Amino acid sequence: TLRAAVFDLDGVLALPAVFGVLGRTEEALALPRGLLNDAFQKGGPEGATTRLMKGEITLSQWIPLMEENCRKCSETAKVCLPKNFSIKEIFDKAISARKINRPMLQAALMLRKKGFTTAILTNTWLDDRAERDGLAQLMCELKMHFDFLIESCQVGMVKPEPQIYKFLLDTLKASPSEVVFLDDIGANLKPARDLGMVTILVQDTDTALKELEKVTGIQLLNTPAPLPTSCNPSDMSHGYVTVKPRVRLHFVELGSGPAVCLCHGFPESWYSWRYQIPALAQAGYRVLAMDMKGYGESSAPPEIEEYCMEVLCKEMVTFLDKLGLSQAVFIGHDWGGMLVWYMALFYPERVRAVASLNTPFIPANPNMSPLESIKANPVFDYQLYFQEPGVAEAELEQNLSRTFKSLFRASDESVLSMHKVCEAGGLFVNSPEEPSLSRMVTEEEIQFYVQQFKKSGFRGPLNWYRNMERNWKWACKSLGRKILIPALMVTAEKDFVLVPQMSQHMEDWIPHLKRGHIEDCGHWTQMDKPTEVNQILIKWLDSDAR
Amino acid sequence: TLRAAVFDLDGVLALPAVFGVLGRTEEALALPRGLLNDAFQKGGPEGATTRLMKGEITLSQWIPLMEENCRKCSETAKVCLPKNFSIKEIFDKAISARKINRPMLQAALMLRKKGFTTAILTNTWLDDRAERDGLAQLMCELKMHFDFLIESCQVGMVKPEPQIYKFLLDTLKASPSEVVFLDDIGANLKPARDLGMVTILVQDTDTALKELEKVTGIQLLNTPAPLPTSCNPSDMSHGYVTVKPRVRLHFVELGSGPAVCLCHGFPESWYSWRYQIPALAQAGYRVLAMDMKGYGESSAPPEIEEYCMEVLCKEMVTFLDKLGLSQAVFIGHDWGGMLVWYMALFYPERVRAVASLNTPFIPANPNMSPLESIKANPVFDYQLYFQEPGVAEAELEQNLSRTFKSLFRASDESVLSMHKVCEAGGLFVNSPEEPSLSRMVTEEEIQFYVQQFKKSGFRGPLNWYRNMERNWKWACKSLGRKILIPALMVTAEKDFVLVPQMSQHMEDWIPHLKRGHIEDCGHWTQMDKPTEVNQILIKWLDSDAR
Ligand SMILES: CN(CCO)c1ccc(Br)cn1
Ligand SMILES: CN(CCO)c1ccc(Br)cn1
Ligand SMILES: CN(CCO)c1ccc(Br)cn1
Ligand SMILES: CN(CCO)c1ccc(Br)cn1
């Protein structure tokens, strides 16, 4: 029985095959059939191309040698290559045209999800072209999804040489009959077959996946749409910035391009953005996913006033100063969404663009106490329960697994009221001791939050709600302002606390406001609807953030 | 006696004054004299500009109000503003034209170096213009050199209001007579004077500095050229990446733009790049200053083979993979310079460009043992002394302060032979027990290296020299290759081990090689000649790295 799946890159994990353009170039130029494919493979094992694939020479060194072979072939065929024939132009164009074969990658992802060891075995080259970054990017995106990447130019061996297959089996730590091997070249398939490996000759992807599905007994074709790539905490770059003597902020960092600072809500973590981090980095951004003050690896001082909006915002500005960033786009959810609007109001020069999930922008009412305002809305009762220091901490810290399992639920899975929490005497009063696991989360993901909250607990996080007066007084200073920088408001249909309707007058204070709306989405937006959130954020970032 | 110096921004720390363009715009357009300056200050404390400076409104909201004032003033003057009059265009142009007043900043730097508390007190605005980043960058560069930055739009007060001065004194924790206050506006100087502060009306910088020099008794004018900005380790962003189960790599990160990976030599630290990090980040690059494997906060496994070039290079590739970087420019010095050439030879697709300080590229000789090659050069005797595990560790770890003080010396300050080290029986045999402190380093900087080396000592670092055979065998695989990616070789006249002459045949293997040469420079290039290194690196990065 199989337990390993090996994939070729060209014509298998990536399409159109860079190789298949030789035939297209031949036809486009009306060159004799197979001329370019013939010059490419000239001299076989002793030839220029084999030396390139074994890593003896670089792609830029190979280019003049391929030109020489093209001439010799044309001389023999008694044809003339055109006046403006260029190998570099042809190969630049072909490499740039090559894309990941999404359905093939999804099958590799599904196999690996089921316990398969996966690898990419490719005949490739050391690319030193001025345009090499395009290929570097493609390989980067692809390789992260596999246990191994075996490149001919790095191992000094090539398919179809039998040694590369013995090397592959050694790397996989598997006997040949345990391996399914996919390749678009019959000649490169033959040694794997001769070894007794299961082999699939790849022509069209769907037939190749049908063969793969039959041989593995795992459904790979016609499967439900998969979730976006998540984060493994131990595989991320972890950053730490001291913003002041007793406060340090922790963040996870991924990608290159414009800085995108992600700001979670209550009671969350940088990990609440697990589905957004890989997607936004892949979209061309440098993601900085915060552990907000009071959370995870960031400092959690006990004082209530350390958590007022003015202090939190000042610290996020220091955070940018220390990292040497003049701006960042700020994207927040829940309490993070609130912080992000205040960053736009008080520090617009440091805010490239601003986006909030669920949290609307509502200006402070100077004629009403914030406690009066909270009292007027029944769904905000939990906020009054959070006021008294120690009360909500004791309940929320009593059983961490129960806390997160009760909180992190989709709109059709609640066990939690949110109204009459004070009268009831607690958040989990009518709650099971052993809540069922939400479809949104795995047990492992819940345990991650449990482990993070063991460090500082709920004091710092609850302190975000204990600055209503202070926040109101500070917010009143911004009453004559408008948000005129690029802004996005994302509403969640089924957030029964931060209801879409509460964002209805935002255009009065943000005239150029752009919107996104997510149907059948509860409070935990990022994990409830990650695909939709990623789609909305990437589209808005590319159009309005640069 | 003075102990604090306060500087205005517009017309003092930054020139030309954004304000002084109103007069220039008036003349360029042949508008009545003072018309634009008059519309700008219209309504005084109750006017649009004061509201902007107090942070009541943003710059984009102020623009239409200034236009309205410009019209009213022109109506009264009985003039017509031209057909195409735009406040936005004028102010965008003026802000963009404004630069740091380098001699004023240098005086502020010198005062602070002498124990002065320094601050910037400015009447400024909340900039939400599409072009706001230019100003954000300028403020970022400037503020890092001061103890405080007090912005009118953030404090809700403006000069000349007396409250802002009381606020300034409070922030400084100083009585007025202890403060020297510099401003280009006589009206904004008057309240500070009325308080009894020493005040300087700034017209031309040189006279203002002459006044400042007289009042403080500190030489600020005609001083020797200062060293580039250094790094305070506690103020940096520290990054950590696990490259494999037992190996994690630590780095310091600063700036935005193309990734520039700095690779130190033996026996150094990320801190060896202290003078390059702020300069390269200011030049428009994202600097990643490594603690190479075996050093500082990076892992230091004991096994010799963990330090061969192949393993070290594979790990630097994993390092880029985990950070999500398809490429980085690699700049190395000494052993780091050696690694960087091998990154270019084996991983050109991951190397944007390559630069080495002192370390030449010399291809492996397949007809001679590497030990034979080392033996042939008398200056490389120390490398034979380093071979025997434990011998050099015991000597180098015996007294860390003595080790670094003996090693880190300019070409005219040696206490260290380097040849006949084996025959002598040690590196420090003819060395003082208490070496004098080199002009290159402070006691504090030496103590930083001492503290870093207390964690893992010299085993890992010395292991870089214990892989001669392994490195030679691996290097021989690259004998048919050429380095064709952008490359820079920087030679140091007085490096008596890595002599400029050893780089003479590099063009045979790197045909497009660019060069830099530093006169009167010893082995410790980055700290010996930081200004020159920064100049060479920035020029090459801007021309060849993007
Ligand atoms: C804002 N958070 C805090 C309440 O615990 C939140 C979480 C769950 C739901 Br449901 C609504 N709001
Ligand atoms: C973000 N929500 C937090 C809901 O838990 C919020 C924002 C501002 C105020 Br006031 C109250 N709630
Ligand atoms: C390469 N390092 C190691 C020698 O200790 C080096 C340091 C000092 C001098 Br001087 C020359 N080379
Ligand atoms: C960089 N230098 C280290 C001098 O300490 C070097 C590089 C390669 C070989 Br082999 C020997 N020395």
Side-chain angles (χ1 to χ4, degrees), chain A residues 265-266 309 333-338 358-360 370 374 380 382-383 386 464-465 468 471 497-498 523:
Chain A
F266 174 97
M309 279 294 142
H333 170 251
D334 183 73
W335 264 114
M338 189 80 273
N358 309 44
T359 312
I374 301 281
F380 284 78
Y382 71 100
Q383 300 196 197
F386 286 0
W464 284 68
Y465 293 92
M468 298 311 179
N471 287 352
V497 167
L498 305 171
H523 182 72

Short mmCIF file of all heavy atoms in Angstrom, two decimals, chain A residues 265-266 309 333-338 358-360 370 374 380 382-383 386 464-465 468 471 497-498 523, ligand 2:
data_model
loop_
_atom_site.label_atom_id
_atom_site.label_comp_id
_atom_site.label_asym_id
_atom_site.label_seq_id
_atom_site.Cartn_x
_atom_site.Cartn_y
_atom_site.Cartn_z
N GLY A 265 -8.82 40.79 17.63
CA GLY A 265 -9.77 41.24 18.63
C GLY A 265 -9.69 40.50 19.94
O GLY A 265 -8.67 39.89 20.27
N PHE A 266 -10.81 40.54 20.69
CA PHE A 266 -10.92 39.90 21.99
C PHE A 266 -11.71 38.59 21.94
O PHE A 266 -12.83 38.59 21.43
CB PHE A 266 -11.57 40.86 23.03
CG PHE A 266 -11.85 40.21 24.38
CD1 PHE A 266 -10.96 40.35 25.44
CD2 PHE A 266 -13.02 39.49 24.59
CE1 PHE A 266 -11.22 39.76 26.68
CE2 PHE A 266 -13.28 38.87 25.83
CZ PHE A 266 -12.37 39.01 26.86
N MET A 309 -7.19 53.43 24.35
CA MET A 309 -6.89 53.59 22.93
C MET A 309 -5.70 54.49 22.65
O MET A 309 -4.85 54.12 21.86
CB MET A 309 -8.12 54.04 22.15
CG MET A 309 -9.07 52.92 21.80
SD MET A 309 -8.30 51.76 20.63
CE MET A 309 -8.90 50.32 21.23
N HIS A 333 -9.82 43.57 13.50
CA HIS A 333 -11.07 42.83 13.70
C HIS A 333 -11.42 43.04 15.14
O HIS A 333 -10.54 42.89 16.00
CB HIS A 333 -10.91 41.33 13.44
CG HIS A 333 -12.10 40.51 13.87
ND1 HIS A 333 -12.05 39.68 14.99
CD2 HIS A 333 -13.35 40.45 13.34
CE1 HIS A 333 -13.24 39.12 15.08
NE2 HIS A 333 -14.06 39.56 14.12
N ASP A 334 -12.71 43.35 15.42
CA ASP A 334 -13.24 43.51 16.77
C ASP A 334 -12.52 44.68 17.46
O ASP A 334 -12.50 45.77 16.89
CB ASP A 334 -13.16 42.16 17.53
CG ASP A 334 -13.74 42.18 18.92
OD1 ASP A 334 -14.97 42.23 19.04
OD2 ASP A 334 -12.95 42.26 19.89
N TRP A 335 -11.90 44.47 18.65
CA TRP A 335 -11.13 45.52 19.32
C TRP A 335 -9.98 46.04 18.47
O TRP A 335 -9.65 47.22 18.56
CB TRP A 335 -10.61 45.06 20.68
CG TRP A 335 -11.50 45.49 21.81
CD1 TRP A 335 -12.23 44.68 22.63
CD2 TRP A 335 -11.86 46.83 22.15
NE1 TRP A 335 -12.95 45.44 23.52
CE2 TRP A 335 -12.78 46.77 23.21
CE3 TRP A 335 -11.46 48.09 21.68
CZ2 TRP A 335 -13.30 47.90 23.84
CZ3 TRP A 335 -12.00 49.23 22.28
CH2 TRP A 335 -12.87 49.12 23.38
N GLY A 336 -9.39 45.18 17.64
CA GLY A 336 -8.35 45.58 16.69
C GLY A 336 -8.89 46.52 15.62
O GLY A 336 -8.19 47.43 15.16
N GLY A 337 -10.14 46.27 15.22
CA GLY A 337 -10.86 47.10 14.24
C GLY A 337 -11.09 48.49 14.79
O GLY A 337 -10.93 49.49 14.07
N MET A 338 -11.40 48.57 16.11
CA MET A 338 -11.57 49.84 16.82
C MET A 338 -10.24 50.60 16.83
O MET A 338 -10.22 51.79 16.52
CB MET A 338 -12.08 49.63 18.25
CG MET A 338 -12.47 50.92 18.95
SD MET A 338 -14.11 51.53 18.45
CE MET A 338 -13.70 52.50 17.02
N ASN A 358 -16.02 43.77 10.83
CA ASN A 358 -17.13 43.80 11.80
C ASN A 358 -17.24 45.09 12.57
O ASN A 358 -18.35 45.59 12.72
CB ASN A 358 -17.08 42.59 12.77
CG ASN A 358 -16.95 41.23 12.13
OD1 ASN A 358 -16.16 41.01 11.22
ND2 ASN A 358 -17.66 40.24 12.66
N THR A 359 -16.12 45.65 13.07
CA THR A 359 -16.10 46.87 13.87
C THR A 359 -16.38 48.11 13.05
O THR A 359 -15.58 48.47 12.18
CB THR A 359 -14.82 46.99 14.70
OG1 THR A 359 -14.63 45.75 15.35
CG2 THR A 359 -14.90 48.14 15.74
N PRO A 360 -17.51 48.79 13.30
CA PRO A 360 -17.80 50.00 12.55
C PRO A 360 -17.09 51.20 13.18
O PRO A 360 -16.55 51.10 14.29
CB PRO A 360 -19.31 50.16 12.72
CG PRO A 360 -19.58 49.65 14.10
CD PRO A 360 -18.58 48.51 14.30
N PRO A 370 -20.24 57.13 27.87
CA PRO A 370 -20.05 55.86 27.13
C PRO A 370 -20.76 54.69 27.81
O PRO A 370 -21.33 53.85 27.10
CB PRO A 370 -18.53 55.68 27.07
CG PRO A 370 -17.94 56.75 27.87
CD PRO A 370 -18.97 57.70 28.35
N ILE A 374 -23.47 52.12 26.13
CA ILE A 374 -23.34 50.66 26.23
C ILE A 374 -24.63 50.06 26.81
O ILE A 374 -25.13 49.06 26.28
CB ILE A 374 -22.09 50.23 27.06
CG1 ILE A 374 -20.76 50.76 26.45
CG2 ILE A 374 -22.05 48.71 27.33
CD1 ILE A 374 -20.17 50.03 25.26
N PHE A 380 -24.80 44.42 24.26
CA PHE A 380 -23.53 44.88 24.85
C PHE A 380 -23.49 44.67 26.35
O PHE A 380 -22.58 45.18 27.01
CB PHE A 380 -23.26 46.36 24.49
CG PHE A 380 -22.79 46.52 23.07
CD1 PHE A 380 -23.69 46.46 22.01
CD2 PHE A 380 -21.44 46.68 22.78
CE1 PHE A 380 -23.25 46.57 20.69
CE2 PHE A 380 -21.00 46.81 21.47
CZ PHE A 380 -21.91 46.76 20.43
N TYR A 382 -22.65 41.99 28.04
CA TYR A 382 -21.40 41.31 28.39
C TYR A 382 -20.30 42.32 28.73
O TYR A 382 -19.48 42.05 29.60
CB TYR A 382 -20.95 40.33 27.28
CG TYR A 382 -20.45 41.00 26.02
CD1 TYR A 382 -19.09 41.15 25.77
CD2 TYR A 382 -21.34 41.47 25.06
CE1 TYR A 382 -18.63 41.75 24.60
CE2 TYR A 382 -20.90 42.11 23.91
CZ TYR A 382 -19.54 42.24 23.68
OH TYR A 382 -19.09 42.85 22.54
N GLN A 383 -20.32 43.51 28.07
CA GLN A 383 -19.33 44.55 28.34
C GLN A 383 -19.46 45.12 29.74
O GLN A 383 -18.45 45.48 30.33
CB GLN A 383 -19.37 45.65 27.27
CG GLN A 383 -19.07 45.05 25.91
CD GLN A 383 -18.70 46.01 24.83
OE1 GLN A 383 -18.75 45.68 23.65
NE2 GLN A 383 -18.20 47.16 25.20
N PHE A 386 -17.92 42.66 32.09
CA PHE A 386 -16.45 42.76 32.00
C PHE A 386 -15.84 43.90 32.79
O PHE A 386 -14.61 43.98 32.86
CB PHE A 386 -16.05 42.96 30.52
CG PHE A 386 -16.17 41.75 29.64
CD1 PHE A 386 -16.62 40.53 30.14
CD2 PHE A 386 -15.79 41.81 28.30
CE1 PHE A 386 -16.70 39.41 29.34
CE2 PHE A 386 -15.89 40.69 27.48
CZ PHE A 386 -16.34 39.50 28.00
N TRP A 464 -8.97 46.05 27.87
CA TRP A 464 -9.35 46.81 26.67
C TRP A 464 -10.75 47.43 26.80
O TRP A 464 -10.99 48.48 26.22
CB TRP A 464 -9.31 45.93 25.43
CG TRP A 464 -7.92 45.64 24.92
CD1 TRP A 464 -6.97 44.88 25.54
CD2 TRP A 464 -7.36 46.03 23.66
NE1 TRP A 464 -5.84 44.80 24.76
CE2 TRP A 464 -6.05 45.51 23.61
CE3 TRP A 464 -7.86 46.75 22.56
CZ2 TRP A 464 -5.23 45.66 22.48
CZ3 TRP A 464 -7.03 46.92 21.45
CH2 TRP A 464 -5.74 46.37 21.42
N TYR A 465 -11.65 46.79 27.57
CA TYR A 465 -13.04 47.23 27.81
C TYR A 465 -13.18 48.16 29.03
O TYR A 465 -14.27 48.67 29.29
CB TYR A 465 -13.92 46.00 28.12
CG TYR A 465 -14.12 45.03 26.98
CD1 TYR A 465 -13.26 43.94 26.82
CD2 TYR A 465 -15.21 45.13 26.13
CE1 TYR A 465 -13.47 43.00 25.82
CE2 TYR A 465 -15.45 44.17 25.15
CZ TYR A 465 -14.57 43.11 25.00
OH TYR A 465 -14.75 42.18 24.03
N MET A 468 -13.58 52.90 28.90
CA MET A 468 -14.68 53.57 28.21
C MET A 468 -14.66 55.10 28.31
O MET A 468 -14.76 55.76 27.28
CB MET A 468 -16.07 52.99 28.58
CG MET A 468 -16.25 51.50 28.19
SD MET A 468 -15.77 51.06 26.47
CE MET A 468 -16.09 49.32 26.48
N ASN A 471 -11.30 56.62 26.69
CA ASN A 471 -11.41 56.44 25.24
C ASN A 471 -12.37 57.46 24.66
O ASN A 471 -12.05 58.09 23.67
CB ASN A 471 -11.84 55.01 24.89
CG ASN A 471 -10.76 53.96 25.11
OD1 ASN A 471 -9.62 54.28 25.39
ND2 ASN A 471 -11.11 52.69 24.99
N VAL A 497 -23.62 41.03 17.51
CA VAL A 497 -23.20 42.10 18.42
C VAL A 497 -22.77 43.30 17.56
O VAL A 497 -23.31 44.40 17.71
CB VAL A 497 -22.09 41.61 19.40
CG1 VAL A 497 -21.42 42.78 20.13
CG2 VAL A 497 -22.65 40.60 20.40
N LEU A 498 -21.82 43.09 16.64
CA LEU A 498 -21.35 44.13 15.72
C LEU A 498 -22.11 43.93 14.42
O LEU A 498 -21.59 43.37 13.45
CB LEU A 498 -19.83 44.04 15.53
CG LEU A 498 -18.99 44.08 16.82
CD1 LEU A 498 -17.53 43.76 16.52
CD2 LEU A 498 -19.10 45.41 17.51
N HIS A 523 -19.28 36.29 14.18
CA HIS A 523 -18.30 37.20 14.76
C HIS A 523 -16.85 36.90 14.39
O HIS A 523 -16.07 37.83 14.21
CB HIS A 523 -18.43 37.27 16.29
CG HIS A 523 -17.47 38.24 16.91
ND1 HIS A 523 -17.65 39.61 16.77
CD2 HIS A 523 -16.29 38.01 17.54
CE1 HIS A 523 -16.60 40.16 17.35
NE2 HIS A 523 -15.77 39.25 17.84
C1 LIG C 2 -14.93 45.79 19.06
N1 LIG C 2 -16.06 45.82 19.97
C2 LIG C 2 -15.62 44.92 20.97
C3 LIG C 2 -16.70 44.05 21.10
O1 LIG C 2 -16.22 43.19 22.06
C4 LIG C 2 -16.23 47.08 20.62
C5 LIG C 2 -15.56 48.31 20.14
C6 LIG C 2 -15.73 49.53 20.85
C7 LIG C 2 -16.56 49.50 21.99
BR1 LIG C 2 -16.89 51.04 22.99
C8 LIG C 2 -17.20 48.32 22.42
N2 LIG C 2 -17.06 47.13 21.76
#
